[PDB]
Design a protein around this motif. Structure first.
Motif: not given
Ligand SMILES: COc1ccc(-c2c(-c3ccc(O)cc3O)n[nH]c2C)cc1
Ligand SMILES: COc1ccc(-c2c(-c3ccc(O)cc3O)n[nH]c2C)cc1
Lengths: 337, 344
Positions: A201, A250, A252-253, A259, A261, A311, A313, A315, B307, B309-310
């Motif tokens: 995304x 996933x 994600x920007x 991010x 995950x 999970x 994640x 960053x 937590x 996800x921006x």
């Protein structure tokens, strides 16, 4: 305590951003500038961490292994201090420096396991030290590699990259590689390996590829470590059924954040033991991979659901300018810890 | 401040477990024991948090704390009397109940007031290091209230003839249906959500008993606490969702999964409200409803984490201890340590 290490410790490390690092390699034909920076910075960082080793407990500093670490760092510090007299204009100096850096990268190559034995022979201050000691080595390995791969005659690294920094890093591609890398390790041991269900995304401009400035290998380390964990956990916990549950990733920007995950259905671990996975006292993986995430103002966290799965994640920073080194400093604020 | 608060400050709080809690009212554990243990404990907890209050910056210690101190000192002194009384004086027990009912209603305005002072803190302009100390102090102050209120309710609901649900031991449900608490807390948010929004998200709930597979999820816990945490997280998940998808056809469900394990009851609520950037998350926890929620989770050794996800959505996860003996109170103690309040 050699006079040079007491001296150069009396300075604070200077953190750099990937924007700046990027610049040491662009229109910048000046390794003249990299040479004057690094012949100063490398001794300071090494000296800072040598000083923090002296506070380690008596029985620890006097391990064969720590004493060997002490002597290598002390040797490389010495070797780098010798370039202080030459001018950055001296073509002969510029080139010897590359060789000496290659020499130090080599000398330090056994540093990280040696350190482990050093502790596996001898609580919460160990952890604090091991995190700093290792961040210190990550940061110096990176500065030396950066200089080596941009200026040396015969180590040119990846041509897309400036040094080892990819200014246009295909994050998902790195995810596929690292997964496809772990996926084939797992097949050395199991009849089956989990599949990869992956979604991206793009916050900024949607349906456009995800790219950010990062160092592809550090990311690769983090992801591989976390994919291996997922796979092993998914295969152990479901040793019954036919096909495994896939691993879900996933990417994600966003405005400030990149991010990632990673979700598995590997049964999870109790809250109580999570804290130990990130302890040096297997590895050195999760702990180190977290140092890598944090090395440029990112992070790596584990959120497990004991009885179901986990999970993971990561960053990362989305902008070069906020991707800034996170460096320990030996001062009093550190003394009281 | 009387030769009282200082005396009981000398002592440190004694954490109960929900098992002990459950027994302090089980098989009719005569109110004598609870009387005896509470007439000591509550003063020590009040004495304890009161000494903390006298370290707060000059001015703060205000239209607010000024009054919190009084209530606590009165309450502490009120509770003192029953020291000169014996547990056998029934007239005293019956007064302990009411005296526990008064202190409560006296303290029901604690939470409002304290965040008033937060008028203002030190100087009417407050910096990060001073401010971090407020965050510090406040987690402790509220945890402390949560803990004293908890023990007082227990005594009242089980000994005063204000009786709660007969099936419960006080405020504790020894057979809490976690999944039903999630659905009501969800629903209470859906309504409040729909008194203000045109439309609301759905609940897509999943369920896994790791401990005993086919079986529904029940652990020992205090339903209202669970409801407070979950309401707030749902309240955030829906509003982020509704807000973020002003442009979307419909709204995406809010997804929650309840899992019971060997040691842990875990609840994960996840949404697609576009998230918040890693840099902001903490602000979310800075001093109130979310900070307080976390305090409830941690009250019996659990935890609340976000937590996000921006640019996509957000994961909120609750951790509770699944065994009653491990569900022990997390209390602040005032001491050398707590009093004593690198990288580039
Ligand atoms: C390092 O040795 C280990 C230690 C624990 C595990 C593990 C994980 C897990 C742990 C981390 C993670 O990122 C994802 C996971 O599913 N889940 N369940 C187990 C038994 C796997 C490897
Ligand atoms: C007004 O307070 C707030 C502040 C920020 C949010 C919020 C959340 C969020 C934050 C916490 C959570 O548990 C779940 C979420 O989706 N995600 N995205 C936004 C813009 C929502 C309410």
């Amino acid at each position: 305590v050699p006079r040079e290490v007491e001296h150069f410790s009396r300075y604070s490390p200077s953190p750099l951003s990937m924007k700046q690092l990027l610049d040491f390699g662009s229109e910048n034909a000046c390794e003249r500038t990299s040479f004057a920076f690094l012949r100063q910075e490398l001794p300071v960082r090494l000296a800072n961490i040598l000083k923090e080793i002296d506070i380690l407990p008596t029985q620890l500093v006097n391990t064969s292994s720590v004493q060997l670490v002490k002597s290598w760092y002390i040797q490389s510090l010495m070797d780098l201090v010798e370039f202080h007299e030459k001018s950055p204009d001296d073509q002969k100096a510029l080139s010897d420096f590359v060789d000496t850096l290659i020499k130090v990268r080599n000398r330090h190559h056994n540093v990280v396991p040696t350190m482990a034995q050093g502790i596996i022979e001898y609580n919460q201050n160990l952890q604090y030290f091991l995190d700093r000691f290792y961040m210190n080595r990550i940061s110096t390995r990176m500065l030396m590699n950066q200089h080596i791969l941009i200026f040396s005659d015969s180590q040119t690294g990846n041509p897309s990259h400036i040094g080892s920094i990819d200014p246009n890093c295909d994050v998902v591609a790195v995810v596929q590689d690292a997964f496809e890398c772990s996926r084939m390790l797992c097949d050395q041991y199991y009849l089956s390996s989990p599949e990869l269900k992956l979604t991206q995304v793009n916050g900024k401009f949607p349906d456009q590829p995800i790219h950010i400035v990062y160092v592809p290998s550090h990311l690769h380390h983090m992801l591989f470590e976390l994919f291996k964990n997922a796979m092993r956990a998914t295969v152990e916990h479901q040793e019954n059924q036919p096909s495994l549950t896939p691993i879900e990733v996933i990417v994600v920007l966003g405005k400030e954040d990149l991010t990632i995950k990673i979700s598995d259905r590997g049964g999870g671990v109790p809250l109580r033991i999570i804290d130990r996975l990130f302890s040096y006292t297997f590895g050195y993986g999760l702990p180190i991979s977290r140092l890598y995430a944090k090395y440029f103002q990112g992070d790596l966290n584990l959120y497990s659901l004991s009885g179901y799965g986990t999970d993971a994640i990561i960053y990362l920073k989305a902008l070069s300018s906020e991707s800034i080194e996170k460096l320990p400093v030996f001062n009093k604020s550190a003394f009281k810890h």
